[PDB]
Design a protein around this ligand. Structure first.
Ligand SMILES: C[C@H](N)C(=O)CCCCCC(=O)O
Ligand SMILES: C[C@H](N)C(=O)CCCCCC(=O)O
Lengths: 224, 231
């Protein structure tokens, strides 16, 4: 029972979506682990797993490498002078997390075709190895339709199942494009949730309630 | 080396706002200065109610006269929603191909600029700039940023081209900073491992005058590459 969580790009609200799904799943009595093998941009304050523990109360938080530079992992590794983890290292970590009645989320860094492991292995390759489906995090902004469609093509090209879309940030008030994009994205795939703009600044209690309301309970329960 | 028909390039981007139009102008300007006749074609233009006019921008920047449009929609949205909002239809596949085809002249370079990124719907149903490039046997020039997120977006776009056997003409960084930061510099080196980087237009290029823009454009591309596009 593994879902990778990937974005159409960087800064679409992916980590916060992982947290919101984790919270929703915890509230349906499901055990959650979140694995983020590679993390970059630590020295500017980024630790995505810690963000997920804080916001969602997840305790099973697995990772393998953290790079200080705010770059793609490969770039960050080349700059640090320290290789990336190995493909087998990543896959085995995720397989060991996997438990009955457990939702295991694997968060990429951040986009689908970013190299995560040696040599040139992507989150798509990992999804394939572990037979995971992919939840795609999207924006509601202009440009999202091309990015969503590009990602969904890349998924289907290697036969990784789409498990749906989440809009990482839903503006208030929406606007004509956001409003339109929401309908358009619902014609391309199932939108599992649209997280209210600003959800990242919520305390643990408000975040949990936002999460329980954001997802369809039956869908979430269904994952396991 | 007499080619009896035009060379066609579709000019696409990894997203919206990555500098496609200014790249079109720049390549158009460079190719003109090599003595190639250039047409620029924009079959679908949205945002006209907000002043958006990519063809006019190109004429302004490059002095290009041969500017072919077709559909214009007032709202600054994806073609499908702008059309629906205006109570208009999207063009048919055939009207796009015809607009491009009627520009044919021997030794001409025709640049076909899309709306937004590659998989934006241009014609109903789900006809995209990638489908058009297949129909007219065009290569695709892909405009990218040097910002974080670019490698994933570039590889997604390139994969989609390959999926339909549309040849990649190379990459163009639409806006290149002075000076380049660590991120920008490593992205450009990573971009060069994925594909030929044809040019990286100076940030602010859009605001140059005809004189400066022409000089910029001539320095920006390899003249062997530009010269070689019409045979
Ligand atoms: C710095 C930040 N932690 C981050 O999202 C890195 C993502 C990698 C994107 C690399 C690219 O596609 O250019
Ligand atoms: C409005 C502006 N003239 C423009 O570039 C339209 C781009 C549309 C992008 C559609 C999408 O992929 O979401």
């Amino acid at each position: 029972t593994i879902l990778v969580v990937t974005g159409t790009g960087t800064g679409v609200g992916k980590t916060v979506v992982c947290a919101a799904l984790a919270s929703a799943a915890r509230q349906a009595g499901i055990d959650v682990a979140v694995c983020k093998p590679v993390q970059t941009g630590t020295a500017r304050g980024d630790d995505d797993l810690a963000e997920v523990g804080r916001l969602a109360g997840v305790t099973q938080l697995a990772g393998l490498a953290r790079y200080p530079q705010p770059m793609a992992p490969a770039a960050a590794a080349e700059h640090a002078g320290m290789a990336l983890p190995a493909r087998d290292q990543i896959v085995r970590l995720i397989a060991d997390l996997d438990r009955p009645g457990r939702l295991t989320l694997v968060e990429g860094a951040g986009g689908l075709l970013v190299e995560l492991a040696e040599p040139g292995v992507t989150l798509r390759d990992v999804a394939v190895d572990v037979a995971a489906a992919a939840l795609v995090v999207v924006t509601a902004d202009l440009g999202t339709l091309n990015h969503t469609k590009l990602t969904l093509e890349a998924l289907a090209a290697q036969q990784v199942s789409c498990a749906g879309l989440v809009i990482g940030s839903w503006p208030d008030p929406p606007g004509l494009v956001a409003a339109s994009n929401r309908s358009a994205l619902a014609r391309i795939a199932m939108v599992r949730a649209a997280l209210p703009a600003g959800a990242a600044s919520l305390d643990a209690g408000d975040f949990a309630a936002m999460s329980a309301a954001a997802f369809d309970r039956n869908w979430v329960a269904g994952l396991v």
